[PDB]
Amino acid sequence: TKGILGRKIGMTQVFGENGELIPVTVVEAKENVVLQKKTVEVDGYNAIQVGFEDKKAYKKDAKSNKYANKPAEGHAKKADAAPKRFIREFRNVDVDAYEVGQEVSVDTFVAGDVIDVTGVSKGKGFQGAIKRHGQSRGPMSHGSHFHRAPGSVGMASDASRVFKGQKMPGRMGGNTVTVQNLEVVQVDTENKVILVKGNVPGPKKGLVEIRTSIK
Amino acid sequence: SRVGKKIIDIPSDVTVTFDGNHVTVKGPKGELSRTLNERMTFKQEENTIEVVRPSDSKEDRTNHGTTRALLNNMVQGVSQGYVKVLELVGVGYRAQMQGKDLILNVGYSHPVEIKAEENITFSVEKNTVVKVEGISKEQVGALASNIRSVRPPEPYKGKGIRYQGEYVRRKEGK
Amino acid sequence: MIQQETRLKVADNSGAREVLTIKVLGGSGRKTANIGDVIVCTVKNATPGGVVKKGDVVKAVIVRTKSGVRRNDGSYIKFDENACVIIRDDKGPRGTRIFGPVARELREGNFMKIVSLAPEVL
Amino acid sequence: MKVRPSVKPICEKCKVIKRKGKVMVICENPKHKQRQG
RNA sequence: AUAUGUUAAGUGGAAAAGGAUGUGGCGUUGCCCAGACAACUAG
RNA sequence: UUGGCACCUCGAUGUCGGCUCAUCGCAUCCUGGGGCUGUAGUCGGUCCCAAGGGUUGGGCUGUUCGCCCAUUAAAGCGGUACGCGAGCUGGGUUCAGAACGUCGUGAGACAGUUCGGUCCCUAUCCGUCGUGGGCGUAGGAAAUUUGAGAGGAGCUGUCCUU
RNA sequence: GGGAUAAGUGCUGAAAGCAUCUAAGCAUGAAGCCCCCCUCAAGAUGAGAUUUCCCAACUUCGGUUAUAAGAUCCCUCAAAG
Ligand SMILES: [Mg+2]
Ligand SMILES: [Mg+2]
Ligand SMILES: [Mg+2]
Ligand SMILES: [Mg+2]
Ligand SMILES: [Mg+2]
Ligand SMILES: [Mg+2]
Ligand SMILES: [Mg+2]
Ligand SMILES: [Mg+2]
Ligand SMILES: [Mg+2]
């Protein structure tokens, strides 16, 4: 419900009530003007897609991607707002309301509405065995030349294969992950940020979509 | 079948209007129970609706009594109306009512509950003894089993919900 | 933390002076400990006299481990000595005169005969 | 319920019937319940 | 394909001692409209 | 498991335990559901259906096995070349040294002990874990996506109220 | 939180006038199976879906071309590696 699309900037602590300290991730949630929505009448899933931070004008000589293009020009002219950089589905909520071309708000929530968080990982390059998966290393002394490699992979020749799904050294990777049931300690309106509880994925100046919980 | 040439009756002001393969006994105590019983031929002329098919099949000689006995289960209850009782035993029980939803207090942490159905007149006419009422004998034998399944009879003292008259066993203890 | 085979200058007036922990009893595969748990432990040193004697497996509560404890406001209590109190298996000590200032956290776990029998409690 | 590879009437009040799977015997005392399982 | 039957388990399309109102064509015999074997009321 | 047979391997198919990493049966150890008890309750015996997940730290010996200490909801039984040395140690077993008991007149012997004893290799192809170029998808491109399918997760204690 | 079940418990019911959970129907019933939770996934060649942008001369379409939309080569780095 009301999937805002903020980005992080860091993490600090905020003293709650009587003595309680709770660590807080501060999520900068800039402008979010709703682009076209799609329903069951058109082709079959009721959803609201949302934009995020804008960029400059269109079609001069696009060296970068902070300039738009004739695809995203007419796709964003339809709602008569500036062209965008991050467009995300929300098939969670509310096919009825949310008129097209509406800024959403920042205060859809209250200080106590539980949320979820979807964001990409850090990604730590190509890393090996006992750092990626929870495997334990070998003995570092008494003569053993088996310090840190993964062990055996399969049996002898009554299974002449190695079974796929084997947890071998590959890339650590940034793939998506969703924590569940975080809460909001405080909402700001004027500086246009919110806060959450604990810590969410996705390193600084990243991207994170948040939405209501499913408890 | 030994209930083969043993047609039950058609004694009622009700009318067994056959159509397709079923009937609909539109009667005094209830309105038009209906079920397509089987694929067997029958007669319904004036006083005793009977049934017979081309005999000598041990899959159809047994299939007789599944058709005659159903047309005796239907017309008898819609004439009269019949269901059994449940006399709660021991102490602690106080089976009150909340309309069609009767609750029980058989010593648990919380009261049990139930949602009765149409054509089944739920009745509790005692301080702590209940008695169902309805039209369809198969349909009312369910709920009288479904309230036995709350606290079945504990075989030392005898506490627990029982039917009206039946020999529940008793084992002595210490 | 205090784990499998630590050695603890016990604080009671009941004859033991140093004990060592066999197991940190709790859940299955329990490894670590901190203030308020209960460990089973066998004495090594023994004061002449006292109550208990050397080589007697006794159960004993943990008090004031070396690493801190995070109470829920943001504070920390770091002591400077691992210590212990031998319990009677009714959550009360053996002797009377336990030394060595005690953390407040062992109160929800109904150890309150130790706290009233103690010096300065934080 | 007593699983056993042989069913016989343990006393002469115990009837011998057939059911959904097997050759259950049913009696009036709750120590005689067998099946050919 | 034709004609007679059989099985209702995937038996066919991998096991015996034993257990059993499964189901067919087969034979013998004792109970019988004077009326049993189902069920009611007498001690 | 202990064997029986000698069918493949002597132009070498590396052999016991342990660490690393698993994967599969159910004749089930805990947890879930019932019948039956010579089941007052709490506990307990015995049997049926059930593999989804769990299955501990130390002393002793090379150990397997085993006994013993303290716990835990439980410390299951097995297959996978008695799983796994082109992934690892080498403690024993099966190398030359030496000694003890003993048998042999002798050289020497022993499923009897006892101390010391070199563990080789840079990955072609399948199989894996990641990760890119070409082409297809009846015009070219960008953005957002539905989800046939496939993976992941599934465990429990103690206290208090009734 | 749902749907069908295994063990088991049931209601109605002849075969076999009584009983009888079953033969035809109707229940209920588990950390188990599927949908639900998260992750990947149209190379799913059965190649899906919505919105938005671009449309010409040689010339027997031999398309000769030479461009748009949109990319890229090449550079300064990094939230990536
Ligand atoms: Mg063999
Ligand atoms: Mg030969
Ligand atoms: Mg040769
Ligand atoms: Mg060779
Ligand atoms: Mg070799
Ligand atoms: Mg089993
Ligand atoms: Mg398992
Ligand atoms: Mg030692
Ligand atoms: Mg000699």
Side-chain angles (χ1 to χ4, degrees), chain A residues 1 3-40 42 44-57 59-60 62 64-69 71-79 81-95 97-98 100-101 104-112 114-157 159-182 184-215, chain B residues 3-4 11 18 20 22 25-28 30 33 36 40 42-43 54 64-65 67-79 81 90-92 95 99 101-111 114 116 134-135 137 139-150 152-153 155-163 165-168 170-174, chain C, chain D residues 1-9 11 14 16-21 23-27 29-37:
Chain A
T1 298
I4 205 79
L5 296 176
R7 61 169 63 251
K8 292 173 67 176
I9 199 164
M11 173 167 52
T12 56
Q13 66 183 4
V14 166
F15 297 144
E17 296 297 324
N18 289 317
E20 298 295 331
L21 188 156
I22 48 175
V24 170
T25 298
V26 44
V27 173
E28 179 175 359
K30 292 297 293 182
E31 65 173 0
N32 287 309
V33 287
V34 174
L35 298 179
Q36 72 181 2
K37 67 182 179 182
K38 184 177 179 295
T39 184
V40 64
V42 178
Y45 63 100
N46 300 114
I48 293 174
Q49 77 174 3
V50 181
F52 185 61
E53 179 63 31
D54 59 347
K55 56 184 178 182
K56 290 185 179 180
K59 193 176 293 299
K60 275 74 60 177
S64 172
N65 196 3
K66 76 175 180 67
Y67 289 167
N69 47 7
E73 180 68 32
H75 181 67
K77 190 187 290 181
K78 181 69 71 178
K84 301 304 193 66
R85 297 178 63 88
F86 297 100
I87 300 170
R88 299 298 173 189
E89 191 192 5
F90 288 101
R91 58 174 296 172
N92 193 6
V93 68
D94 198 355
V95 62
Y98 290 102
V100 55
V104 282
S105 73
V106 73
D107 60 351
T108 57
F109 297 152
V110 297
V114 296
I115 51 96
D116 293 333
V117 163
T118 304
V120 303
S121 301
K122 292 293 291 296
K124 277 88 74 175
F126 179 81
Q127 278 190 350
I130 54 96
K131 177 64 181 299
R132 177 171 171 183
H133 307 87
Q135 297 184 0
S136 182
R137 72 194 196 276
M140 289 290 183
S141 67
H142 296 288
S144 67
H145 298 97
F146 180 71
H147 296 98
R148 197 178 167 91
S152 70
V153 294
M155 293 71 71
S157 68
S160 180
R161 198 178 70 248
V162 56
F163 297 97
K164 65 170 69 179
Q166 194 46 251
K167 302 184 291 181
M168 303 182 71
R171 196 188 295 268
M172 180 70 77
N175 51 358
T176 61
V177 66
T178 64
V179 300
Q180 291 181 355
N181 303 320
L182 298 181
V184 175
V185 56
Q186 196 277 337
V187 182
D188 185 80
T189 303
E190 285 80 3
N191 297 322
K192 198 72 180 298
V193 295
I194 63 170
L195 301 180
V196 289
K197 185 176 185 294
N199 42 2
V200 300
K204 300 182 181 183
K205 63 184 72 64
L207 181 66
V208 42
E209 66 188 11
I210 68 173
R211 62 189 69 184
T212 195
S213 298
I214 198 62
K215 44 99 193 57
Chain B
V3 297
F18 292 100
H22 65 279
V25 181
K26 181 66 176 65
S33 297
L36 280 78
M40 187 178 178
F42 61 96
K43 66 180 74 68
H64 186 283
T67 308
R68 184 263 183 192
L70 268 300
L71 273 301
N72 198 3
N73 282 319
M74 291 179 69
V75 302
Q76 180 62 259
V78 181
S79 173
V91 297
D101 295 331
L102 58 93
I103 57 174
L104 291 83
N105 298 320
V106 198
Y108 289 173
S109 299
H110 60 87
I114 194 170
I135 56 169
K137 185 185 267 77
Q139 193 272 340
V140 302
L143 299 176
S145 177
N146 290 319
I147 54 96
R148 182 175 176 84
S149 299
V150 176
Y156 290 155
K157 182 64 69 70
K159 195 266 192 295
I161 300 98
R162 60 184 61 185
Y163 278 165
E166 72 275 16
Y167 180 73
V168 295
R170 296 297 300 270
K171 292 183 182 294
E172 67 183 4
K174 225 122 296 176
Chain C
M1 284 70 72
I2 279 180
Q3 64 179 3
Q4 179 63 258
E5 280 94 12
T6 56
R7 289 174 70 94
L8 291 77
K9 182 179 183 294
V10 75
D12 299 334
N13 55 352
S14 66
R17 190 179 293 115
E18 184 179 2
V19 79
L20 59 87
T21 64
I22 167 62
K23 283 183 92 288
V24 183
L25 66 90
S28 175
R30 186 76 180 275
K31 303 301 292 187
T32 67
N34 48 2
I35 296 99
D37 298 334
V38 283
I39 47 94
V40 56
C41 54
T42 70
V43 296
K44 287 295 181 184
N45 193 0
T47 302
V51 176
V52 299
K53 294 300 292 181
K54 180 179 179 179
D56 291 330
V57 47
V58 297
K59 290 178 289 296
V61 72
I62 182 67
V63 170
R64 66 181 191 272
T65 189
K66 175 67 69 67
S67 68
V69 277
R70 180 182 171 90
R71 64 185 68 251
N72 296 325
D73 59 352
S75 298
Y76 293 100
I77 313 296
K78 291 183 182 180
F79 294 96
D80 281 327
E81 181 72 25
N82 296 320
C84 176
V85 167
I86 299 173
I87 66 171
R88 195 179 60 82
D89 197 5
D90 197 73
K91 276 65 62 179
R94 295 287 183 88
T96 303
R97 294 173 60 92
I98 68 99
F99 299 139
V102 177
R104 188 181 293 107
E105 179 175 353
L106 44 88
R107 188 184 295 271
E108 288 82 4
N110 65 15
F111 285 140
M112 296 181 68
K113 194 179 266 78
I114 292 174
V115 183
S116 71
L117 268 62
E120 191 269 331
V121 172
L122 34 83
Chain D
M1 185 59 66
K2 295 170 66 65
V3 295
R4 185 170 286 117
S6 176
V7 293
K8 292 183 174 68
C11 68
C14 299
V16 175
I17 61 176
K18 295 179 176 66
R19 286 182 184 272
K20 181 179 284 290
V23 194
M24 292 284 176
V25 298
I26 295 297
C27 204
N29 47 3
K31 293 175 71 176
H32 302 169
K33 290 180 177 67
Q34 306 182 2
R35 72 181 184 185
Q36 188 178 6

